Symmetry: D2
Subunit: 387 residues, 4 copies
């Protein structure tokens, strides 16, 4: 039961199942995986595709001949399995040169290098068929207040993204960008810390249509925010170009638990929203099998990501299709929420005594919302406990 | 020392010093204050002005004659003291009718009433000379996932703000709106939970120039965010129309401590930013003297808000003026952060071997940022411990 | 399905279903309930009993004749329904006199009064058959560092609890005390902020056997802690005298959502632990139907507390009984965790070359824990998705 | 000004200034330091001593001859500088063998090895003159609920600490143990997550007098707790055997900022408490110079730890010595908090009409606490802004 299919579009970063287990306090617990083995094992589990940072696929500093051979082997694995590459990204965080940032490093020479490293990988992403190019600016930020003038840093961040937009336009590429917010870690505070900040920033770019967000479940939860609500705002803005699925237990370091772990009810409401809205992008997992696990546990954890999505999809669909739930939604006036407040227009609203002088506030206030009954129907559906 | 002056533009809500001390677990500890007494006492402390919700100035449900008398008494107090009213707002949260929201209530009749209540108070705000009309949507949100379709709620929130913009335009008013984010409390999650989300929303309004943000120190800190960074993004966007100053100890219920309490170093960096950027708006305190205090403690707490701002202003100015700090800022390449990455343009960047093939990444990575020395100069200046 | 029974021992505070909906920003949305009506309605839902603060049952300041009549009516309702009163507590937080604390108020006269108020209610609790007397010191703490010397306050808190122990001993009462931790709210920081701090404090009382903890799900989660882990430590110490069940979404104000809401997987692991350990005390709900609800929603929310406990009980029992889970627990060495490290004794351990010189650390480190497979079996059982 | 002296007893872990800068997302930015160089550089800054994990001083897996040479070189550096070694600890977290724990690993063979590794290092610690042996169980815990039975794990943790106590007793050593709590990171939840939980656990050990706590500023703040309050409870219990000083910005990953950074006012109240209580132990820094820094920044950051302690010590002493503050403390009844509630005894309290029938609750409730004036005197003293 709960078998993944190609139409599910489940994807994984090479760095997810390939995470060797090094953490702030501990050495690697697993050997490095050849990307070819990850492609083949993920395909066997029913994944649709993989994603990569440049430096996951091509060791940093590789010669041109080494680069070609790494890509050739990877493409053979994709061809052997039918796996796709819908998204790629740049590693602008691991190498010590990026310790104060890539695009917003105080040192101008580093900012220029970061752009050149990204541009090289955009070309490769296009060659591999990627539709989306993610940017997670994990080093953009500060540990202290004097170190980073945020207005200047936003100027540099806009300059960088504008140059990348000029680049893809000039090459005729169809790829689009997706900015991934995170509030903190590894910097004390990261620039563009939430979906909202990233959405607002995009509106000030020269070609805003080329940029959206890549929100990650656990990152919004590191600020204690409601991930489904943030996804709704991204959808409302037309900017949900990609998504990273995982789990997180609240306000901690970025745990990258398998999807469904962490906040299970938020996972349910997320799946309900994505499916109801018709989100058509990859269901991408940015997760880490815990370092306690051997390779069998790596593949179990990856399989669990997909399984949990599919269980939640079934339960959310059953919730929305249940005539008792539909009745409860009407009892709670969800239908009215979807209707304009004043399609009659401002003057009619100003002239409407039913909106002011003749509005019976106490009668209105007496009406219960019936939200608890609705939420218990939702709980019963999630748990398969209807009756 | 540290005496407030009119040019400081310190303002207070009537509801701040007037908070009677009722909390989720406790009855009022102080009697209600007549707004006239608050105006006179705040003036004696050196405040510039006050602000109000409709229902702070005019008891809810007042007749027209009662409304006129309350306003007349208040205006006499303003005239007697020279106090100004730079900002007003609507109470769309206390009355039970607003239990599921004002502008985004599921019930359409409530949404219409909320608009009419706001419009009435915009007229009064203009009469009193207010330049800014704040909206804190404290009831917009949910405790459960099925209760509130966030895309529909954002449609209703946009409709409401668009109608208010149409209203002020039609009346020729110069007032502008400032949306106040908060992540949670009293709703389990509040819509537009951070500065970023509010900035992004504004960009989708029909007349975006009429709307900015009113960020509150403690509200961003309830999401664990960096308040100075968020203020920098608002300034970068041209949207810092007003600000609420207070203190908060991290991820808790909204404490509304006096300004300078809570995160003291964030208060220092905030003042540094506002002063360096030339912010010209009110320095408004949205705070609550703790319910442990009698009226002498109320006025001490209000005086402390202003005193702490003035101490921090002195220390931040001394930091920025110190030639040793200026040298440290250059050592940390803050000057380079402010210079364009690639004013030479995309093609020149692509052709520049110094940005890629000839970039010595290891030499760059060896350079220290010297951020710790800079931050200890900042600490020494804050504490008055230079030497 | 999932029908409560007397053996389930589900109990509710009068103040839970009776919460009128006043919050930091909003007036009451529901009328006050007569305790008699709450007793009868809860009995109809299948509850076992109720609990009370003194001032929930007897209005503060009541005359002796008024007190007698309130108690008489309440006892008739208990007799009419078969409901029990297993626990009572004192309100040492609502009245303004308690603004700096009860037992740890700086003012000595208030500390003495707080003790007398508690002692009066202990007598009543015993009369009504209560086995446990809870103390939640919600006003014990501070908003500022100079206001409360914590060593002195702990001396006063110990003195108070020691006097209460002397009192019950002197009267021959069998009741025991349960201290309820909370980290913050309504005070900026509350003394004894977690289960651990309360357990440690108890060990320093003169008669430690008379005192245990009353942990509340949401309170530990307000510190981001693992509630099942804290309950395990309380059980390990022999100190889980009572428990408060509810839901919470992380590090926020105390939400008091119905049990099962908030962190659903933590609710599952909690029920698993209580049932596996054979906890025999009340399953008490300290929750608040949201103020959006009318009385039908109050009773729906209360019914949901019990329903969710019963669903989770079924799923946890099925998890533990499943031979595949039992195999997975052995694969993950849970059996070995339960066996002594060195029952052979210190000298044998020191002499055992297999524990040091001949321990193959790399072979040991290669063994996977298989925790992800185990956790996905747990997820499948919770969701009723085995297969 | 603010020059460290030997009587200040400032100490640093080898792993602090020696941290190479590897984080969850980034490679090392600094070369490894020889412990000899750290000893000499710290001595030049005015430190009193250093501390070590076994594997900081002796590379893991070293032969006996290699071990002797590493220790000999280190002792020469201590002799050359006058530096002391007041504390040592075991690394039971870095090596992959410890991925599920040391003392509470599910695998019994690992638990035995962890004990043998610790015992070997206790012998070395004693040889170097250490008075305290710290244990930070960073791997004790879980990412999932089924992986770790917490009651069984506490049994194993008690067994381990009891064996270590038997060991030191049998050898006649004067060293004592200090357990370091942390709430999470690197495990999803860590056992003994706060000062309170550790204090409670100690009370159940066979020889409780041999064990205390080693609280760390940032670790308690990762649970949003008040670090000065927790230190007060440890002092009250007689269990503050050692302390780790650093800074943290709230509920995040463990930042290990230099002391004084993070929550500056909490640092002030901490120093006030340690000095007022006469804490006589090391002022030990467990911090990390940010990876942005070169070695000059490492030493600047270390110097800043000590400087900030000394500034805060001066300001707290001035606060306590100021006759205006002493008057304010009496106005706020801090003197009364320190006096017994009922030295007259239980019967006298029960018979005292002034404690109940004749207690004027409204007159008592009208008295203000004057806490805001007191706190603004504290702020003025911290900032050197008295006047
Ligand atoms: Mg619709
Ligand atoms: Mg500039
Ligand atoms: Mg057992
Ligand atoms: Mg004393
Ligand atoms: Mn992540
Ligand atoms: Mn991601
Ligand atoms: Mn606030
Ligand atoms: Mn505000
Ligand atoms: Mn609660
Ligand atoms: Mn409770
Ligand atoms: Mn730490
Ligand atoms: Mn430490
Ligand atoms: Na700039
Ligand atoms: Na979209
Ligand atoms: Na709509
Ligand atoms: Na602006
Ligand atoms: Na005392
Ligand atoms: Na127990
Ligand atoms: Na055991
Ligand atoms: Na002590």
């Amino acid at each position: 039961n709960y078998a993944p299919t190609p139409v599910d579009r489940f994807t994984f970063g090479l760095w997810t199942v390939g995470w060797q287990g090094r953490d702030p306090f501990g050495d690697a617990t697993r050997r490095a995986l050849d990307p070819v083995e990850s492609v083949r094992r993920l395909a066997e589990l029913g994944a649709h595709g993989v994603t990569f940072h440049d430096d996951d696929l091509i060791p940093f500093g590789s010669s041109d001949s080494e680069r070609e051979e790494h890509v050739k082997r990877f493409r053979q694995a994709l061809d052997d399995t039918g796996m796709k590459v819908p998204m790629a990204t740049t590693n602008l965080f691991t190498h010590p040169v990026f310790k104060d940032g890539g695009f917003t490093a105080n040192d101008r020479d580093v900012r220029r290098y970061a752009l050149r490293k990204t541009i090289r990988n955009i070309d490769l992403a296009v060659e591999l068929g990627a539709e989306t190019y993610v940017a997670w600016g994990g080093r953009e930020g500060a540990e202290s207040g004097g170190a980073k003038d945020v207005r200047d840093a936003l100027d540099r961040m806009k300059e960088a993204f504008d140059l990348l937009g000029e680049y893809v336009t000039s090459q005729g590429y169809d790829i689009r960008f997706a900015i991934e917010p995170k509030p903190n870690q590894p910097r004390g505070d990261i620039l563009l810390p939430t979906v909202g900040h990233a959405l607002a920033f995009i509106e000030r770019l020269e070609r805003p249509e080329l940029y959206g967000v890549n929100p990650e479940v656990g990152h919004e939860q590191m600020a204690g925010l409601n991930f489904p609500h943030g996804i709704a705002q991204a959808l409302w803005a037309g900017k949900l170009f990609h998504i990273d699925l995982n789990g997180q237990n609240g306000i901690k370091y970025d745990q990258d638990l398998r999807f469904g772990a962490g906040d299970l009810r938020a996972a349910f409401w997320l799946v309900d929203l994505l499916e109801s809205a018709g989100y058509s992008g990859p269901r991408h997992f940015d997760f880490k099998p815990p370092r306690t696990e051997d390779f069998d546990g790596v593949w179990a954890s990856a399989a669990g990501c997909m399984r949990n999505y599919l269980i939640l999809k079934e339960r959310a669909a059953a919730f929305r299709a249940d005539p008792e739930v539909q009745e409860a939604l009407r009892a709670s006036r969800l239908d009215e929420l979807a209707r304009p407040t004043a399609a009659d227009g401002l003057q009619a609203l100003l002239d409407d005594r039913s909106a002011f002088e003749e509005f019976d506030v106490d009668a209105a206030a007496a009406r219960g919302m019936a939200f608890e009954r609705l939420d218990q129907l939702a709980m019963d559906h999630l748990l398969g406990a209807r009756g």
